Design a protein around this ligand. Structure first.
Ligand SMILES: [Mg+2]
Ligand SMILES: [Zn+2]
Ligand SMILES: [Zn+2]
Ligand SMILES: [Zn+2]
Lengths: 55, 94, 501, 84, 171, 229, 122
C-alpha cells in the first residue's frame, strides 16, 4: 500500500532499505541455508598442484 | 501447479538447488549488471570482449551482476522515468 | 546457468537507496541526445536517429538488435534517452514539497529561519531519522518568521499549480532553481537532504528521461500498422509544448503569455506523470478514458506492484491420467511419446556426447529421439522446425541442445495433495506409446492413488545440480523406509499379494 | 580469525548425503563444461557417472566449508572424508 | 607521493581453466589488471610487492554457475599526489599557454596565467622558453611547484601545479 | 542424535526376568565348576579354574551389568517395558556372523575372557556421537549412548557369547567392527530439515482419525485452549 | 604507509630484481629494465616511473639507509618529508614543512648535519 507516498517520502529524505528480510534474498535467488545449501564448496588448489602436470 | 505443499515437500527432501531453480526458472528471473559505485542502470557489457563500462561513473573496473525479477526491472526502469533513483548497494551501511 | 557466461561477480543486493536523477546523471546515462520532433524520420522506413523509437534506446523488434549493448532481444533490457527542456519546470509530485521547502527556509539567502541555539534544533539534528528531523524543523520553523538576515519571509501560496509570494511577485522556476543553487551544504543537511546525492536542487525538472519501448507495452494488435501507448502520445505533446516554449523566447511576445505557455507545458508533464491530480482535470483520452499516467502504473490493482505480468514460453511440466504396469521397475515411470516430445532437456555439447547429440539434432523435433532448439554460446536460439537446413548443421563445444525427454532421465513426479514428503519422488523415464503415465503398483500406496481417472504431475530438471539432487536424494528406492514410523511404506499389494499367498 | 584449526576439527569425518549430492552435481557441471578429467574414461559419456567414478577414487578437487552456527567454519578436503 | 598499501581484488575463473594453472595464471591476470593501472582510491599501482608469492586463497564456487570466485589479497606500492603538495617537476613541453611537466608516471599541465609577470615567455628565442633576468625555464629543468588540485580521471588521474606562492622555485 | 529411519524394535535383556535367572544367565564363577564355563566350548578350560585376575574381571563385568539393571529399572523404564526402538540390530549381526564363519558343528572357541571384556569396553568407548575433548562434550557423549551401551553390554555377555553364540576370534572381531560401522551409519546427517519432517509425520496420522478424543482434542491441544471441553 | 623517496627506491629496485629473477626466469640500467615489462600502458607507466626515480636519485646506498633508519626510528609523514625534500636552514625548512615550527624540540642543525653528511654532500 501507499507506494506513491512511499516514493514521495523516499525522495524527501532518502529512504533506505535494510534488506534484512528473507523476501529480499528470495527475490535475489540465493541458495538457502538448508540441506545441500548448508555449506560452501571451495576449489582445492593444493590437490590441483598435487595433480599431474597435465592437471 | 507448483504450490506451497510441493515447496514444503522439497524442503523436507532438502534439495535447495531445486528450490532455487523453481524460484528462478518458474518465475521472472533475469540477469542485470549494476555498477558497484553508482548503483544505477548505466552498464554496457561485451561478453565476447569480456569488458564492462559504467557510463554514469566512467567506471570500467568493478561491475557486479544480479538476478532480479524482470517485472522489478520494468518497475526500476519506469522508476528512472520517475526521476528518482534507486541506488542499488550490495553492501550494508548500518 | 541458462544465461551466457559473464565474468562479473554474482552477488546479492543488501541496501537499496532511493535518490534523485540529477540532470547531469540523466545525460550521462542517456545513450544519445534526442531532439528531432516526431517518431518517423521521413516516412521512408527505418527508425529515426533522434525519434521516440531510436534504435540506440533498444527496440522491441525481433530481427533487430540493440546497438548500445550489442545483445539480442532475448538479453537486451533496453536503454534510456533524455529530452532537455530549455525552460526548467516543476515536478508534480514535489510541487507541494516545493512549496513546503520554500516555506521552510529563507528564499532570499538560503538560510534557515532558526539557528542551533535552540536545543530543540540540536535534538532534531542529532535525530538519526531524517524524517523526524525534517518534521521537527518544519514544526519549529513555521512559528518563527525572521530568518538568520533581517528580511521578512513572504508566504508561498499554491494557486492551481502556480506559487504566489505574499511579502509581491509570482515565483519563477529560474529564480527558485537559483535559490536552491545558493543553498549551503549545512543547510542542505539541516533540511533533511544530502548534499552529495539527495541534493535539493533535483526537484527542478530540466531534462526528462524517455524510457525504452520495453517499459510501456506497445501491443502489436495488427502487424506493422500500429498506434502507440498513451505515454508516447503524451510525450509527443510535451515535446511540442517544449518546442513552442523555446520558439517564444527570442521573438517579441508578452511575458505573461510566455509564462502561461510554460504553465501549459508544466500541466502537460504533470498529467503525463500524475493522473489523479487534486483540484484539476486529468488527461482524458480521445475515447474519454483518463490517460494512464506512470504514477498509476505502480499503484492499484492495475499497478505492477500488486502484480501484472505476461509473456513467456515455459513448458517444463505436464499433468495427465495414470494406469498400472506390472512390467515396470519400482523407480520407472511410463511416459507417452507425445509428452516426451513436448518436454525437453538442455544438454551441453562435449567431446563424448557429440555424435549421438548430432544424430538427435538431425532427427528433428517431430521424431523421437530428437531435439527442439539449439542455443549458441551467445544465446541465439535456432528452432529446428523452421531450419530446413538442419542436415547441414554443425555443433561446437559449449553449445546447448534441448533434446527430447529420453530413457533413464530423472524426473520429479507428484500427486495432489502432497501431504507427506514421499508424495513427490524422482523416477526414471521409459518412453512408451499411448497417452497414459505408467507406474508400478507398489508405489501407488505411498502416492495414495488409484487408476479410476486420477491425474499426476511431472517436472523435468533443467541443470546438472538438479539432476544429481533428484537422483541422490529424491530417488524412489531411498523412500522405501519412512522416518514417520521407521517402517516401510511400499509393499506387495493386490494381485501380487493374492498370488504370492 | 574464524577458521578452525585442522587438529581442532570436531565435525563428523564422513561425507553426508547432502555433501555427496552437491559434490556430484558440481563436478558433473564442471565436467559438462569441458573441465579436465582427473580419471580415465573407458566408455562412459555421462558427466554424473564420471563424477561418481572420481568420488569413488577420492579424486575430487573440492573443499567443503562446514559452517558452525556461530559463524566459524571447518575446511574438509573431499580426499580426507570417509565415503561409504 | 609513494605509499605501501594493502589491496584486494575479485577474480572470476571459468571451470574450463581448472588445471595446473591455479596460482601463476591467476597471478598473471592480477598483474595484467593491476600492475600499471590507476584507481581513484589509491592512485597508480605501478608494481606489486612479492608478486609471485601472492596468496590467492581458496576459490568459492558460485552455485548454479560453476565459476570460481577468488579473493586475491596482496600488498603493493602506489603513487599518490596530494592537494598543496610541493614537488619538483621535470618539465617536458612548453607551449604559449603553459607547460607540461612529467612527474612519476603522470603529467601535470601548468598554465601561464599563474606564472609571475616578471618571467616572460619567448617563442622566437631558441628554444621557446620562459626567461628573464637571471631566470630561465625550458625543457629539461627542475621546477618546484605546489599542486593546487588533483582531478580523479580513474583511468589516468591528472593534477595542476602552481608557482604563485612564496619560497617556490629551484633551491 | 539418531535418524528416524535407522531404529528398530529391540529388547534389553537385563530388564526382564527374576534375579535368579539373571544370575544364572550372567554371573560367572571360576571356583565352582558348575558355575564356570562348560569345558566343551573352550580349548583352555583346565587353564581357567583358580585364575584370580579373570575372576576380578568377571566380577567387574557383573557389577557393571547389575548397575545397568538398576539404572534401567529404577530410572528409565519404571513400568518394566523391555522392547524399545534402538539403532543397530544386534541379533541380525550375530546370526550373520554365525552364517559367514560357520559357527555351527560345536567346535571349542579360542576366544579368551580378557579379550572379550576389553573388546566390549573399547567398542562401548568408540560409539562417537559427539567429538572433542571438552568436558561437556564428553559428558553429553556419555549421556547420549547410555541406553545403547546397556543394550550392547546385555547382548554381548561372556556366557552368552561363549555358551550360546559360540563366537570365535574372527567372528568376534567382525561383530565389533560391524557394530561400530553400523552405529556410525545410523547418525543423523547435519543440515537435515527435521522440523518439516516432524510436522508432516505428525499431521499424516490425523488423516485416518469418556473424554474428548481425535481431531477435536488435537485442535484443543494445538490451540492451547484455556477452557477445554 | 607513509614512505620517503629513499626506501621507495630500495623497494622498487628489489621488486624489479625479484621479478627479473622470477617472472623473466634468467634475466641493470634504468632504460632496459623498464623495457623488460610488457603492455603498452604498463610499459609507459613503468618507464616514466623509473626515469623519474633515476633522475631524482637521492639515496643510492643500502647501509646508509639502514643508518638513517637507526638514527630516526617524529611523525611518519614528517619522516618521509625530511628525506623527500632537501633542506639547508630552518627558515625555509619551516616554509616547506610547517610542522617543524610547532615541535618545541627542533634539533634541525644536527639533523641537517647527518642528512648532508652521511652520503655525498648535496
Ligand atoms: Mg481416484
Ligand atoms: Zn556507476
Ligand atoms: Zn540494448
Ligand atoms: Zn534569509
Amino acid at each position: 500500500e501507499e507506494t506513491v507516498e512511499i516514493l514521495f517520502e523516499a525522495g524527501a529524505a532518502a529512504e533506505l532499505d535494510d534488506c534484512r528480510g528473507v523476501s529480499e534474498n528470495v527475490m535475489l535467488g540465493q541458495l538457502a541455508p538448508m540441506g545441500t545449501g548448508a555449506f560452501d564448496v571451495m576449489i582445492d588448489e593444493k590437490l590441483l598442484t598435487s595433480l599431474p602436470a597435465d592437471y | 501447479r507448483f504450490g506451497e505443499m510441493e515447496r514444503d515437500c522439497m524442503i523436507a527432501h532438502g534439495a535447495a538447488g531445486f528450490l532455487k531453480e523453481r524460484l528462478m526458472e518458474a518465475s521472472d528471473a533475469f540477469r542485470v549488471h549494476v555498477c558497484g559505485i553508482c548503483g544505477l542502470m548505466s552498464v554496457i557489457a561485451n561478453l565476447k570482449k569480456n569488458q564492462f563500462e559504467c557510463r554514469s561513473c566512467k567506471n570500467k573496473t568493478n561491475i557486479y551482476q544480479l538476478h532480479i525479477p524482470y517485472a522489478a526491472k520494468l518497475l526500476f526502469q519506469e522508476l528512472m522515468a520517475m526521476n528518482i533513483a534507486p541506488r542499488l548497494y550490495t553492501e550494508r551501511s548500518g | 546457468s541458462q544465461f551466457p557466461y559473464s565474468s562479473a561477480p554474482l552477488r546479492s543486493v543488501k541496501e537499496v537507496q532511493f535518490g534523485l536523477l540529477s540532470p547531469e546523471e540523466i545525460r550521462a546515462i542517456s545513450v544519445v541526445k534526442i531532439e528531432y520532433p516526431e517518431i518517423m524520420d521521413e516516412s521512408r522506413q527505418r527508425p529515426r536517429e533522434g525519434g521516440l523509437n531510436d534504435p540506440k534506446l533498444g527496440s522491441i523488434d525481433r530481427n533487430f538488435k540493440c546497438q548500445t549493448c550489442g545483445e539480442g532481444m532475448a538479453e537486451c533490457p533496453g536503454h534510456f534517452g533524455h529530452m532537455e527542456l530549455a525552460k526548467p519546470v516543476f515536478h508534480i509530485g514535489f510541487i507541494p514539497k516545493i512549496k513546503k521547502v520554500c516555506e521552510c527556509i529563507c528564499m532570499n539567502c538560503g538560510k534557515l529561519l532558526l539557528d542551533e541555539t535552540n536545543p530543540t534544533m540540536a535534538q532534531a539534528i542529532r535525530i538519526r531519522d531524517p524524517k523526524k528531523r525534517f518534521n521537527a524543523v518544519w514544526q519549529l520553523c513555521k512559528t518563527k518568521m525572521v530568518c538568520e538576515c533581517g528580511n521578512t519571509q513572504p508566504v508561498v501560496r499554491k494557486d492551481g499549480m502556480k506559487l504566489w509570494g505574499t511579502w509581491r511577485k509570482l515565483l519563477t522556476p529560474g529564480e527558485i532553481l537559483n535559490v536552491f543553487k545558493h543553498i549551503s551544504p549545512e543547510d542542505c543537511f539541516r533540511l533533511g537532504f544530502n548534499e552529495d546525492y539527495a541534493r535539493p536542487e533535483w526537484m527542478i525538472i530540466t531534462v526528462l528521461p524517455v524510457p525504452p519501448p520495453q517499459v510501456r507495452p506497445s501491443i502489436a494488435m495488427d502487424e506493422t500498422t500500429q498506434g502507440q501507448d498513451d505515454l508516447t502520445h503524451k510525450l509527443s505533446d510535451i515535446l511540442k509544448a517544449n518546442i513552442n516554449v523555446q520558439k517564444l523566447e527570442m521573438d517579441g511576445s508578452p511575458q505573461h503569455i510566455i509564462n502561461e505557455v510554460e504553465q501549459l507545458l508544466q500541466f502537460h508533464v504533470a498529467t503525463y506523470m500524475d493522473n489523479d491530480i487534486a483540484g484539476q482535470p486529468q488527461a482524458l483520452q480521445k475515447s474519454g478514458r483518463p490517460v494512464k499516467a506512470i504514477r498509476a502504473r505502480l499503484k492499484g490493482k492495475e499497478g505492477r506492484l500488486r502484480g501484472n505480468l505476461m509473456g513467456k514460453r515455459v513448458d517444463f511440466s505436464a499433468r495427465t491420467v495414470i494406469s498400472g504396469d506390472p512390467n515396470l521397475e519400482l523407480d520407472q515411470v511410463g511416459v507417452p511419446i507425445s509428452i516426451a516430445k513436448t518436454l525437453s532437456y538442455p544438454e551441453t555439447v562435449t567431446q563424448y556426447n557429440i555424435h549421438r547429440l548430432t544424430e538427435y539434432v538431425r532427427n528433428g523435433p517431430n521424431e523421437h529421439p530428437g531435439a527442439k532448439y539449439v542455443i549458441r554460446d551467445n544465446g541465439d536460439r535456432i528452432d529446428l522446425r523452421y531450419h530446413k537446413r538442419a542436415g547441414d548443421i554443425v555443433l561446437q563445444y559449449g553449445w546447448k541442445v534441448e533434446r527430447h525427454l529420453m530413457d533413464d532421465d530423472p524426473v520429479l513426479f507428484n500427486r495432489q495433495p502432497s501431504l507427506h514428503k514421499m508424495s513427490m519422488m524422482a523416477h526414471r523415464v521409459k518412453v512408451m506409446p499411448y497417452s497414459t503415465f505408467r507406474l508400478n503398483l507398489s508405489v501407488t500406496s505411498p502416492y495414495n492413488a488409484d487408476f479410476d481417472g486420477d491425474e499426476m504431475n511431472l517436472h523435468v530438471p533443467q541443470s546438472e545440480e538438479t539432476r544429481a539432487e533428484l537422483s541422490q536424494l529424491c530417488a524412489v528406492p531411498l523412500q522405501i523406509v519412512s522416518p514417520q514410523s521407521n517402517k516401510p511404506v511400499m509393499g506387495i499389494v493386490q494381485d501380487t499379494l493374492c498370488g504370492v499367498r | 580469525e574464524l577458521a578452525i584449526l585442522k587438529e581442532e576439527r570436531t565435525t563428523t569425518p564422513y561425507l553426508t548425503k547432502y555433501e555427496r549430492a552437491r559434490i556430484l552435481g558440481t563436478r558433473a557441471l564442471q565436467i559438462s563444461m569441458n573441465a579436465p578429467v582427473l580419471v580415465d574414461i573407458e566408455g562412459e559419456t555421462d558427466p554424473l557417472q564420471i563424477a561418481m567414478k572420481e568420488l569413488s577414487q577420492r579424486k575430487i578437487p573440492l573443499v567443503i566449508r562446514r559452517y558452525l552456527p556461530d559463524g566459524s567454519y571447518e575446511d574438509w578436503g573431499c580426499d580426507e572424508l570417509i565415503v561409504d | 607521493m609513494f605509499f605501501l598499501k594493502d589491496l584486494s581484488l575479485i577474480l572470476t575463473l571459468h571451470p574450463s581453466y581448472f588445471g595446473p594453472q591455479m596460482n601463476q595464471y591467476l597471478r598473471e591476470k592480477l598483474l595484467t589488471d593491476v600492475e600499471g593501472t590507476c584507481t581513484g582510491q589509491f592512485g597508480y599501482i605501478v608494481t606489486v610487492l612479492d608478486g609471485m608469492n601472492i596468496d590467492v586463497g581458496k576459490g568459492r564456487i558460485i552455485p548454479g554457475s560453476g565459476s570460481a570466485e577468488f579473493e586475491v589479497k596482496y600488498r603493493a606500492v602506489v603513487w599518490k599526489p596530494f592537494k598543496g603538495e610541493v614537488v619538483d617537476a621535470i618539465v617536458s613541453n612548453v607551449s604559449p599557454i603553459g607547460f607540461f611537466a612529467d612527474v612519476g608516471p603522470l603529467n601535470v599541465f601548468v598554465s601561464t596565467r599563474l606564472i609571475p609577470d616578471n618571467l616572460v615567455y619567448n617563442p622566437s628565442n631558441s628554444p621557446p622558453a620562459y626567461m628573464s633576468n637571471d631566470e630561465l625555464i625550458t625543457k629539461g629543468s627542475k621546477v618546484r611547484l605546489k599542486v593546487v588540485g588533483t582531478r580523479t580521471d580513474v583511468n589516468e588521474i591528472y593534477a595542476i601545479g602552481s608557482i604563485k606562492e612564496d619560497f617556490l622555485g629551484a633551491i | 542424535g539418531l535418524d528416524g529411519t535407522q531404529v528398530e524394535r529391540q529388547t534389553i535383556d537385563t530388564i526382564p526376568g527374576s534375579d535368579k535367572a539373571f544370575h544364572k544367565r550372567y554371573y560367572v564363577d571360576l571356583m565352582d565348576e558348575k558355575n564356570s564355563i562348560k569345558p566343551d566350548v573352550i580349548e583352555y578350560a583346565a587353564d581357567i579354574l583358580g585364575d584370580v585376575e579373570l575372576q576380578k574381571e568377571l566380577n567387574s563385568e557383573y557389577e557393571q551389568l547389575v548397575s545397568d539393571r538398576k539404572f534401567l529399572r529404577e530410572i528409565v523404564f519404571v513400568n518394566g517395558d523391555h522392547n524399545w526402538p534402538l539403532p543397530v540390530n544386534l541379533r541380525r549381526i550375530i546370526q550373520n556372523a554365525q552364517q559367514i564363519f560357520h559357527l555351527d558343528r560345536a567346535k571349542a572357541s579360542d576366544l579368551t575372557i580378557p579379550e572379550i571384556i576389553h573388546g566390549v569396553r573399547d567398542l562401548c568407548k568408540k560409539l562417537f556421537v559427539l567429538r572433542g575433548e571438552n568436558e561437556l562434550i564428553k559428558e553429553a557423549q556419555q549421556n547420549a549412548t547410555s541406553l545403547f551401551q546397556c543394550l550392547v553390554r546385555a547382548r554381548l555377555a561372556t556366557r552368552r557369547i561363549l555358551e550360546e553364540f559360540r563366537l570365535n576370534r574372527d567372528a568376534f572381531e567382525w561383530v565389533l567392527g560391524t557394530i561400530e560401522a553400523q552405529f556410525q551409519r545410523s547418525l543423523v546427517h547435519p543440515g537435515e530439515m527435521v522440523g518439516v519432517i516432524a510436522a508432516q509425520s505428525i499431521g499424516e496420522p490425523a488423516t485416518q482419525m469418556n473424554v474428548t478424543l481425535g481431531v477435536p482434542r488435537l485442535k484443543e491441544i494445538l490451540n492451547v485452549a484455556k477452557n477445554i471441553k | 604507509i607513509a614512505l620517503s623517496l629513499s626506501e621507495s627506491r630500495l623497494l622498487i629496485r628489489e621488486a624489479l630484481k625479484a621479478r627479473s629473477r622470477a617472472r623473466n626466469g634468467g634475466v641493470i640500467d634504468d632504460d632496459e629494465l623498464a623495457k623488460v615489462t610488457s603492455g603498452a600502458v604498463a610499459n609507459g607507466v613503468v618507464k616514466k616511473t623509473l626515469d623519474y626515480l633515476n633522475t631524482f636519485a637521492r639515496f643510492k646506498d643500502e647501509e646508509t639507509c639502514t643508518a638513517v633508519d637507526q638514527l630516526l626510528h617524529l611523525h611518519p609523514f614528517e619522516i618521509a618529508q625530511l628525506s623527500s625534500l632537501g633542506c639547508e636552514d630552518v627558515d625555509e625548512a619551516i616554509t616547506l614543512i610547517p610542522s617543524l615550527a610547532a615541535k618545541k624540540e627542533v634539533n634541525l642543525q644536527r639533523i641537517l648535519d647527518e642528512l648532508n653528511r652521511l652520503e655525498d654532500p648535496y
